[model samples]
Target: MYDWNIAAKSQEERDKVNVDLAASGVAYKERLNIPVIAEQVAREQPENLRTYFMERLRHYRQLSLQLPKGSDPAYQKDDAVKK
Candidate 1:
């Protein structure tokens, strides 16, 4: 049961946001993960968008490297929280 509590000013605005997220080369549902960052990347300079993606990739790799293996009893899930 996932809840996405997103609200937009108007239908047009909502549609634009959806389209924008897709334009960023990520799925539309990605807005649920990083709405602020996603929207910023969605409608920014191509260079900025590229830089953001690279930054995100680096962070993701770091996080993965920090994660413990499931074989370890101390291993914990990410908790899947946004920001």
Candidate 2:
């Protein structure tokens, strides 16, 4: 229904879309588990769209790792593995 291909048309545009999707994903963390939210949100989306969403969500999660400390929303308070 939308111009998905447009987002992939240029490197600059693709990076912009990535950041935007990452930001959107970070917001979802407020009301849902970040790992589970993407699939739920994409429930009505086509399979290909869901894949794209999930991929970006993963990038966002990875980006969060770089800000592992301090007062950052991207920083998770709990660690899944303590060792």
lDDT of every model, 2 decimals? 0.41, 0.47
Q: Compared with the true structure, what per-residue lDDT tens digits does model 1 show for residues 43-63?
A: 532443454455554554444
Q: Which stretches of candidate 1 lie over 4 Å from their true place?
A: 1-48, 68-83
Cα error of candidate 1 at position 55, Å: 0.5
Backbone clashes in model 1, listed as residue pairs: none
Candidate 2: where is the Cα deviation over 4 Å?
A: 1-23, 26-47, 68-83
Clashing pairs in model 2? none
Q: What's model 1's lDDT at 60?
A: 48
lDDT for 9 in candidate 1 is 62
Cα distance off (Å), candidate 2, residue 31? 11
Cα error of candidate 1 at position 48, Å: 5.5
Top candidate by lDDT: 2
Q: Write the per-residue lDDT of candidate 2 for residues 1-83, one digit (tens) a residue.
A: 22234537766556555444544444445434444344333333444344565676666555555434422454444765332
- Local distance difference test, candidate 2: 0.47
Backbone collision tally, model 2: 0
